[PDB]
Design a protein around this ligand. Structure first.
Ligand SMILES: Cc1ccc(C(=O)Nc2cccc(Cl)c2)cc1Nc1nc(-c2cccnc2)nc2c1cnn2C
Length: 268
C-alpha cells in the first residue's frame, strides 16, 4: 500500500466518525485535498486488523467509479487511511439539494457509472453489503464513485435480511434501490413505512412505484433488480450493458413509464 509520511498530511476539519477514530477533510503533499480516516490510541487488535485490512482491499481497487486510495499511514500513530476528496459529497444529499436540476441523460449516466463500479467489485469478489446513495461520492465531473463509509433494511435484498446471504446478487437488489433514489432526486425509499412494513410489503409482492419523469426502460430495469428469486436478477454485467446501450441511443429514454398520481386536481 503506498505509505504516506505524517508530515505530508494536514487535518483541517472533521467530516464524520470512524469505528475507532474520526474522519477529516485535509490536504496531502507529495497540494491535494483528501479525506482522512484515523485509528486513535487504544484501538483493539480486531480494529487494527479491520482498519489495515480495509486499506489493503482499497489499495487493490483501480477503477474510474471506485473511490481512490491515496495511501496509508501505518508506521506512525494515529494510523490513517487517506483517499481522494470529492467536492460534491455524497450522492443522496447532493441530489436532494439539486432537485430537478439534471437531465434524464445525466441521471442515467450516473447510474451507468455506479453500475460499472459495482461490476468491477463483483468481478473482484467483493460484496459491498451497504450499497446506497449515501455511500456514493460525486466529483466535479458528475462521476459517481462507489465508497463505503460504514453504517439498512430498505436497501437490502430479502435473503440478506432473512438468512444473512449477502452476495453480488443482493448488491443488485440494492442497486435497484439506488436507481430509484437517483431518479427521485433522493426520495426516502418506501417513504414513512416502518422497517417491518417494508419487509411485509416486499414479501407480499409490492414494489416501489415508478418515479416521476422516469424512462420506461429504467423502471423496467429496477423492477428486475427486485426479483424475489436471487437467481432471476440481472448480473451487474447485464446492467452495465443495458445502461450503456440506452445512453448510446438516447431516444430510447424518451418513452416514460406511467406515473401513478397520488393526488387528483380537477380544473376546467
Ligand atoms: C477516508 C475514507 C476511508 C475509506 C473510504 C471507503 O470508501 N472505504 C471503502 C471500504 C470498502 C469498500 C469501498 Cl468501495 C470503500 C472512504 C474514505 N473517504 C471518505 N471520503 C469522504 C468524503 C466526503 C466528502 C467529500 N469527499 C470524500 N467522506 C468519508 C470518507 C469516509 N467517511 N466518510 C464520511
Amino acid at each position: 500500500t503506498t505509505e504516506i509520511h505524517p508530515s505530508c498530511v494536514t487535518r483541517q476539519k472533521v467530516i464524520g466518525a470512524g469505528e475507532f477514530g474520526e474522519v477529516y477533510k485535509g490536504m496531502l503533499k507529495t497540494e491535494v485535498p483528501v479525506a482522512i480516516k484515523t485509528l486513535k490510541a487504544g484501538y483493539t487488535e480486531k480494529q487494527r486488523v479491520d482498519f489495515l485490512g480495509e486499506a489493503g482491499i482499497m489499495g487493490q481497487f483501480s477503477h474510474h467509479n471506485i473511490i481512490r486510495l491515496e495511501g496509508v499511514i501505518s508506521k506512525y500513530k494515529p494510523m490513517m487511511i487517506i483517499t481522494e476528496y470529492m467536492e460534491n459529497g455524497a450522492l443522496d444529499k447532493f441530489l436532494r439539494e439539486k432537485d430537478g436540476e439534471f437531465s434524464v441523460l445525466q441521471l442515467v449516466g450516473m447510474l451507468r457509472g455506479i453500475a460499472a463500479g459495482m461490476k468491477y467489485l463483483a468481478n473482484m469478489n467483493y460484496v459491498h453489503r451497504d450499497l446506497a446513495a449515501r455511500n456514493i461520492l460525486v466529483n466535479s465531473n458528475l462521476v459517481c464513485k462507489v465508497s463505503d463509509f460504514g453504517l439498512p433494511i430498505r436497501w437490502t435484498a430479502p435473503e440478506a435480511i432473512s438468512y444473512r446471504k449477502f452476495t453480488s446478487a443482493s448488491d443488485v437488489w440494492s442497486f435497484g434501490i439506488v436507481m430509484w433514489e437517483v431518479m427521485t432526486y433522493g426520495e426516502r425509499p418506501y417513504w414513512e413505512l416502518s422497517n417491518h412494513e417494508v419487509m411485509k410489503a416486499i414479501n407480499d409482492g409490492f414494489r416501489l412505484p415508478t418515479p416521476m419523469d422516469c424512462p420506461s426502460a429504467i423502471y423496467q430495469l429496477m423492477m428486475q433488480c427486485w426479483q424475489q428469486e436471487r437467481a432471476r436478477r440481472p448480473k451487474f454485467a447485464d446492467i452495465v450493458s443495458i445502461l450503456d446501450k440506452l445512453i448510446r441511443a438516447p431516444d430510447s429514454l424518451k418513452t416514460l413509464a406511467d406515473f401513478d398520481p397520488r393526488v387528483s386536481i380537477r380544473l376546467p
